[PDB]
Amino acid sequence: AVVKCKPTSPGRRHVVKVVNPELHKGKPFAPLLEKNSKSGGRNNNGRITTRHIGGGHKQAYRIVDFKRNKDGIPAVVERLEYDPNRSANIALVLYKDGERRYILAPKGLKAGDQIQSGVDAAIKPGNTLPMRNIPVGSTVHNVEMKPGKGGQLARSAGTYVQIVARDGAYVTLRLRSGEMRKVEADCRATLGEVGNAEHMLRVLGKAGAARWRGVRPTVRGTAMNPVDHPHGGGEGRNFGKHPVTPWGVQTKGKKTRSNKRTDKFIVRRRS
RNA sequence: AGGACCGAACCGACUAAUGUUGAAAAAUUAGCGGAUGACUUGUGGCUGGGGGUGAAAGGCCAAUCAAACCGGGAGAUAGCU
RNA sequence: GCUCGCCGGAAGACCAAGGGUUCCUGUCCAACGUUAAUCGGGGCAGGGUGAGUCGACCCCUAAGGCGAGGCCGAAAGGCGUAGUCGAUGGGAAACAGGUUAAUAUUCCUGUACUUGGUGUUACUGCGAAGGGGGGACGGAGAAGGCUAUGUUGGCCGGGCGACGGUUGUCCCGGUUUAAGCGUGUAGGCUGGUUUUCCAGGCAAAUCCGGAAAAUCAAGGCUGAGGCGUGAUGACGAGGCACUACGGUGCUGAAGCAACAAAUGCCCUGCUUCCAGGAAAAGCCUCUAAGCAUCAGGUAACAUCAAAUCGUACCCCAAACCGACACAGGUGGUCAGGUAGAGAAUACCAAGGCGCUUGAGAGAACUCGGGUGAAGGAACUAGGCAAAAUGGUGCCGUAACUUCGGGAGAAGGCACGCUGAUAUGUAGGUGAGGUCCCUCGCGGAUGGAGCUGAAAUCAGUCGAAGAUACCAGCUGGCUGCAACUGUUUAUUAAAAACACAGCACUGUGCAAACACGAAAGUGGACGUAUACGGUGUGACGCCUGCCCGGUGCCGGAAGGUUAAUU
RNA sequence: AAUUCCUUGUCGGGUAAGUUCCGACCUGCACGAAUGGCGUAAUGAUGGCCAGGCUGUCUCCACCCGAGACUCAGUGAAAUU
RNA sequence: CUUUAAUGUUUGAUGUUCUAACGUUGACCCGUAAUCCGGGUUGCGGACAGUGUCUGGUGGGUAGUUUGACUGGGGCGGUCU
């Protein structure tokens, strides 16, 4: 649930936690773990490519199965777990053959719910089938963009896709951004919505709370000595120029989609 | 429980005096601030000059930075001393 | 050598980094030492560093580096796979005592341990560049149970007092002993055992995991410390003979208990929280391909080997970085006594120093300090500075408020010593004995003894009782910023920068964007409740009119318009 | 007003006397609503102001303890010219 | 030769479809005890994308430069034949 703390100190007035006792109070399944090194926004060249990244708490990577290629084998949920590498939570499932794996947590999954993947799977949350067999107007998540590679859409806290039509080997989708995209009619998509919806209602409350996540402070630019930014300086707060990124781009309306490759699955991009 | 309180280590450096060919090419003395955290620290590693890094001051990059240092073009040019 | 003074959570001791003979002895004083110098971290010469167990090397790896082929790139070269390097990490084994002018857990004495090689004997399913397990890990907090260590007492030994008293409840001193082996406790974790089956662990698998059954509840793992052994020993205050008063052989009494008690150990535990907490090998297992009267494997004894390099000395400093024998800077470990909440502070122990110019005088003036008549901020840009406040317990505590705070608000009272309550209370600790028992490091009871507050009452001394060091000035109005924080190393710590929060916009993933001639990488092993950019800057009530201009997002009818022809 | 030139705006408060400060007035030279507007408890080595206490800050300095200055011996600089 | 239609050949524009170039930071196998790369099978896109040359637009993102003289100091103003 969501709980609002008390103002016992400056830094706890506006803090709002998202407590979920369903999560496991113990160590996760190690066989499915893998080191995850922090970069700091730097690349092989050692230069900062993405700013506002650095520090944070150590993390271990949870190997999640977005493909769900184990068809015709039921799996029961053992326990929910906290995943720092992502917003949503995961669920450790056990397959009848003796296999254990991680998956994203749908809206109302618990410990003991049974699920199955494939074409003959049941139409209920948690199960995975290609969008060819899914009905129209339903709600799914962890959608695949190309058959066989794994889910890439609707992977966040409370994201969900709504199948609106199916013409042929393609199927139309309305993503959480309002974009009306269509994908092949064989990409595997899980039923239901990812359940952490109360995550957006969270409030960090203090600065150090953002540093734990690994986000470094953001310096605006208006007070940045124009040698370092177009906005630069000025005697006071002048800012008598158009809003502009570094390297000279608008940042307040300029569309920067320069792909021109697909331009076919896009139908009602947005607006 | 706490970017919580008082306060040593530790990290800092608000005030004053001294010193200013100083003990010291920025310190000492008396007080001062933070002191479980956006903390501090050791070792090793990475980012290289119109580039880096920067909680951003045009600050820092080996006592040197509105474009480091070394060598070279080079005996630059100097209607000025 | 006898005194004085200083540090004593260091101005002591052991190391690393670093330096690289400064270590010890003898000799010398030209130069070096901010003076002299017989002295020296100086000159000269000689000697000095002993390891199967400490450390490195070695084995395994992180970040990251190099990188066969390979991709990319005018050349140079860049990125990078398999792989190979890379500790600040993980990985087998030694303690005590004694000894040298200078080294030792390295030598000697005594007692031990570990990993390997070979052989012998007995019993046998061995094998991986593979699978699994383990290794393997956060922060905060809470007690409990122990020890290091200390205090007192007891014991042994010595002493009877430079000046009143001191054969006693007196004074001084000592009362130490390891690794290892055995016992396997406080307490922590886990339900075990056997059979059957199985879409999984790239193939297999007696191992792992899963599933269905049967049978029992006691099974196992871990685990400080203590006890015994080690130890009929060593050490040992002091003596017996030599005694160049430099020191060696021999001998050498007591060698216990109780209380207190860590920041260390049990604890990589337990509980709890969100920011959700390295990898790999060794080690334990599983088998495949293969080898089976072999080879291998297991157990016991015997035997062999464990090399190589480092080891001196300084190491908060005169030996490192600072041009100096420079009020500087430099990481980890050990952490005594009294008072104390305390690693603060004061005085001391062990131990180590008195800071490489001194003597004398006692003027102005300067520096660092103390005291002060009456007045008390009149000083001054300004209460700069200084003075003052300063602790514990009880009572008590405002406007306002986001109901948390404000607040230690303000303000006021009592604080010493002795005696009694109580020959030392409350409480803590806990022996003997007794009872019981799964006869054990047991349980119950027992309460000796040790330790020990706090308080009331009464009395008493002093000018002053939180007496010293240590140790908040307070209150009111108001601007700015919400706050904690960050910033101009070296004149600016702030109303600036950040900040959580809000909004706009971009981004559908081979994402946008960014570093890159490109490959490719980051963004992200993320997927719109996400990432990037921008402005604003908690919260509270709100955020109004204008799209002409600039820019951005869209559009059509026409006009205009490049290369090309 | 961190914004007000004329300006020490005017009134009132505090003071024996207040160009600053606080509270109102509005004639806003030249505030203004996310280059945010008006408020805001708490916080601040932050800026301004008024009090209590406290004092050598001062009226107005006096004395004293120490280190230099001064004399003797030894060693023996410096900018400048 | 004044004249136009179904044709044939010619090329031009749009649209639908296809696959063989090309793309694949999709899946499966081998080299190979390797998430590189390469080859191979298949699938999805598909003559679009993307690259090269030419070309228009945008372009302080980044460079190289300019920004007069007289002047009762200079600047502002004014002047320059």
The domain limits of chain A are 1-113, 117-194, 195-271
Is the C-beta of residue A114 closer than 7 Å to nucleic acid chain C?
no
Is the C-beta of residue A211 closer than 7 Å to nucleic acid chain C?
no
Nucleotide nearest to A147 (CA to C1'): E26
For A169, residues 6+ apart whose C-beta sits below 8 A from its C-beta are A184, A185, A186
Tell which phi-psi region holds residue A198, choosing left (phi > 0), alpha (psi between -120 and 50) or beta. alpha
Is the C-beta of residue A10 closer than 7 Å to nucleic acid chain D?
yes
**Residue A105 main-chain phi, psi, to 5 deg:** -90, 115
Helices H, strands E: what count in chain A?
A: 1, 16
A137, amino acid identity? G
Which stretches of chain A are assigned E, i.e. beta strand?
A: 2-4, 16-18, 33-35, 60-62, 75-81, 90-95, 100-104, 114-115, 128-130, 139-141, 143-144, 151-153, 161-165, 170-174, 180-184, 188-191
CA of A261 to C1' of C321 (A): 61
User: A1-113: which CATH architecture?
Assistant: Beta Barrel (2.40)
For A205, residues 6+ apart whose C-beta sits below 8 A from its C-beta are A5, A11, A12, A13, A14, A15, A16
For A92, residues 6+ apart whose C-beta sits below 8 A from its C-beta are A28, A29, A77, A78, A79, A80, A81, A100, A101, A102
Residue with tokens 């896709």: A161
Structure tokens at A144: 């695949």
Is the C-beta of residue A3 closer than 7 Å to nucleic acid chain B?
no
The correct answer on CATH 3.40.50.1100 for the domain covering A195-271 is: no
**Closest by alpha carbon to A131, among A174, A181, A171?**
A171
CA distance A40 to A47: 10
CA of A97 to C1' of C22 (A): 74
Structure tokens at A96: 């009848």
Resolution (angstroms) stands at 2.8
What is chain A's alpha carbon radius of gyration, rounded to the nearest angstrom? 22
CA of A159 to C1' of B69 (A): 56
Beta strand A33-35 pairing with A16-18? unpaired
For A234, residues 6+ apart whose C-beta sits below 8 A from its C-beta are A240
Is the C-beta of residue A106 closer than 7 Å to nucleic acid chain C?
no
Is the C-beta of residue A45 closer than 7 Å to nucleic acid chain B?
yes
For A133, residues 6+ apart whose C-beta sits below 8 A from its C-beta are A119
